[PDB]
Curated annotation (Swiss-Prot):
This is Trypsin. Keywords: Calcium, Digestion, Disulfide bond, Hydrolase, Metal-binding, Protease, Secreted, Serine protease, Zymogen. Belongs to the peptidase S1 family. Its cofactor is Ca(2+). The keyword Ligase does not apply. It is an enzyme of class 3 (hydrolase). Residues 1-221 form the Peptidase S1 domain. The lineage of its organism: Eukaryota, Metazoa, Chordata, Craniata, Vertebrata. The record marks D171 as: Required for specificity. InterPro entries: Peptidase_S1_PA, Peptidase_S1_PA_chymotrypsin, Peptidase_S1A, Serine_Proteases_S1, Trypsin_dom, TRYPSIN_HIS, TRYPSIN_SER. Its main location: secreted. Ca(2+) binds at E52, N54, V57, E62.
């Protein structure tokens, strides 16, 4: 997250880190046995780390649980990033408490202008690199389809939204991928793609979760 602030410890209790030796992408817990993330973050072995704030220190709130099943959307397209969404089933259920909690799926899609909270342990610099140990937060609004499609002509499908700022300076980046965009208590976005991070006139683009509630529910019931 570029241009953000350090979240209060354990204030984002549905955020997960996906780990394969080290943190590589984010995710959100949506029920006790299932995490949702981005399909472009796919790898064959993943450990899910819940209850994290500082990813470099063991703090005593953490649960580390191995993924048992990894399911990418059947129509994910690696060229356009359409349908960039993946579900992970945990090998044993997470135990829900004050530091580990689910986030609701969306009851409807969101209005332009809606304010949201984006979080993750991705890159924090817009020139260079630096990955933080402490979770970072950023508040940003859903952009109208007009501002989003003008930024990326021909590249925005019906399953994508833009959230962020056209002046640059504040955005998600590498390592935030798969993490949550939560607006009025509902998971509306998954960090997906963009041109660079925090560039003027190039806001982040996010998978539009309100189109996938049926797929998520049907996949959970079947597995
Ligand atoms: Ca920790």
């Amino acid at each position: 997250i570029v241009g953000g602030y350090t979240c209060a410890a354990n204030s984002i209790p549905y955020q997960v880190s996906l780990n394969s030796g080290s943190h590589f992408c984010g995710g959100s817990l949506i029920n006790s046995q299932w995490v949702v993330s981005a399909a472009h973050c796919y790898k064959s072995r993943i450990q899910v780390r819940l209850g994290e704030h500082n990813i470099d220190v063991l703090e005593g709130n953490e649960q580390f649980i191995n993924a048992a099943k990894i399911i990418t959307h059947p129509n994910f397209n690696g060229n356009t990033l359409d349908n960039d969404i993946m579900l992970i089933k945990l090998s044993s259920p997470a135990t829900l408490n004050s530091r580990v909690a689910t986030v609701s799926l969306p009851r409807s899609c969101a209005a332009a202008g809606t304010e949201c909270l984006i979080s993750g342990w991705g890159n924090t610099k817009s020139s260079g690199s630096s990955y933080p140990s402490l979770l970072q937060c950023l508040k940003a609004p859903v952009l109208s389809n007009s501002s989003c499609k003008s930024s990326y002509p021909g590249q925005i499908t019906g399953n994508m939204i833009c959230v962020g700022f056209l002046q640059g300076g504040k955005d998600s980046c590498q390592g935030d991928s798969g993490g949550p965009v939560v607006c009025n208590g509902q998971l509306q976005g998954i960090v997906s793609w963009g041109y660079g991070c925090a560039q003027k006139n190039k806001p982040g683009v996010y998978t539009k979760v309100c189109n996938y509630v049926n797929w998520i529910q049907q996949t959970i019931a079947a597995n």
